[PDB]
Design a protein around this ligand. Structure first.
Ligand SMILES: C=C1[C@@H]2CC[C@H]3[C@]4(C)C[C@H](O[C@@H]5O[C@H](CO)[C@@H](OS(=O)(=O)O)[C@H](OS(=O)(=O)O)[C@H]5OC(=O)CC(C)C)CC(C(=O)O)(C(=O)O)[C@H]4CC[C@]3(C2)[C@H]1O
Ligand SMILES: CCCCCCCCCO[C@@H]1O[C@H](CO)[C@@H](O)[C@H](O)[C@H]1O
Length: 265
């Protein structure tokens, strides 16, 4: 019971620390949708630009907007973890001695299973986190997001982009473990691997988040592939990678921060 709460706090620290660079990343990633929704007046020039305008127009507190969602995200996930993660690992898991391909495939399957299982209960918090991040306001808080989204689109409005998120989880896990196996030291390895994996899986996250953004709007995408097609055709392939640099920055920040807090505890 105590260890649970301590874990909660422990990740709350990391998420809260990484919050300012996260919102900038989310802003750059989702700016076209905000432009469609008349929430943003002009496209951002880049990271520095977004930081500047957001600071001068919203303030300093704004960089932590939506972060409470990230904080309270810990508690429902871990309850599902403790209850199902071991059992799920038991069904697919392998030692590499039993065969590398079996180990890898079982790892993808297990990560995907546990992942989808968590998201089935937790996705809406991610949705709210995103919607609150992307603003300049349209929503007032978590409860407002839930109430309004349910009012317009209902439950499905809260879970939009679920499938590319699951696909994203599997892809990311595969790249992560693959690179981690193919390869001051720990920080290096972790950073490089997480970077490669997050970058290669980044378009799925863009599709996911923008689909989230379409909630509460008359115009929506007709599937993840449809979103992909439209974004590419109108804005270019690079549009799928908007905010990726900021996301990497978020990674390098987060790793150091969580290491420091672990050292402090
Ligand atoms: C399409 C995408 C992109 C790629 C996949 C995901 C994650 C990276 C996917 C990542 O997925 C994490 O991957 C880790 C490495 O495999 C894995 O750790 S491990 O099993 O011990 O090895 C985590 O599992 S857990 O049991 O420890 O908790 C797993 O998180 C989850 O499965 C919980 C879900 C609620 C997400 C979690 C997460 C993270 O940045 O870390 C997070 O939710 O914070 C995602 C961000 C959103 C995207 C980005 C999703 O939009
Ligand atoms: C304790 C006894 C040893 C059991 C595990 C042995 C180490 C497993 C390493 O396997 C190899 O890993 C490579 C990754 O670099 C794969 O690319 C390659 O396909 C695979 O053959």
């Amino acid at each position: 019971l105590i260890d649970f709460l301590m874990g909660g706090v422990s990740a709350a620290v990391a998420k809260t620390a990484a919050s300012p660079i996260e919102r900038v990343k989310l802003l750059i990633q989702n700016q076209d949708e905000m432009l469609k929704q008349g929430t943003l007046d002009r496209k951002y020039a880049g990271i520095l630009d977004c930081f500047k305008r957001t600071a001068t127009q919203e303030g300093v507190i704004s960089f932590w907007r939506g972060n409470t969602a990230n904080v309270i995200r810990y508690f429902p996930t871990q309850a599902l973890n403790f209850a199902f993660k071991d059992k799920i690992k038991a069904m697919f898991g392998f030692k590499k001695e039993e065969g590398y391909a079996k180990w890898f495939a079982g790892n993808l399957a297990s990560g995907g299973a546990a992942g989808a299982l968590s998201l089935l209960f937790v996705y809406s918090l991610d949705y709210a986190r995103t919607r609150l991040a992307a603003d300049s306001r349209q929503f007032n808080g978590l409860i407002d997001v839930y109430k309004k989204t349910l009012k317009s689109d209902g439950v499905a409005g809260l879970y939009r982009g679920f499938l590319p998120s699951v696909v994203g989880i599997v892809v990311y896990r595969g790249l992560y473990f693959g690179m981690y196996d193919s390869l001051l030291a720990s920080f290096l390895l972790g950073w490089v691997v997480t970077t490669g994996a997050s970058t290669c899986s980044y378009p799925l996250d863009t599709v996911r988040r923008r689909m989230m953004m379409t909630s509460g709007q008359a115009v929506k995408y007709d599937g993840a592939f449809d979103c992909l097609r439209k974004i590419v055709a109108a804005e270019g392939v690079g549009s799928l990678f908007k905010g990726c640099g900021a996301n990497i920055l978020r990674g390098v920040a987060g790793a150091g921060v969580i290491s420091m807090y672990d050292q402090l505890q």
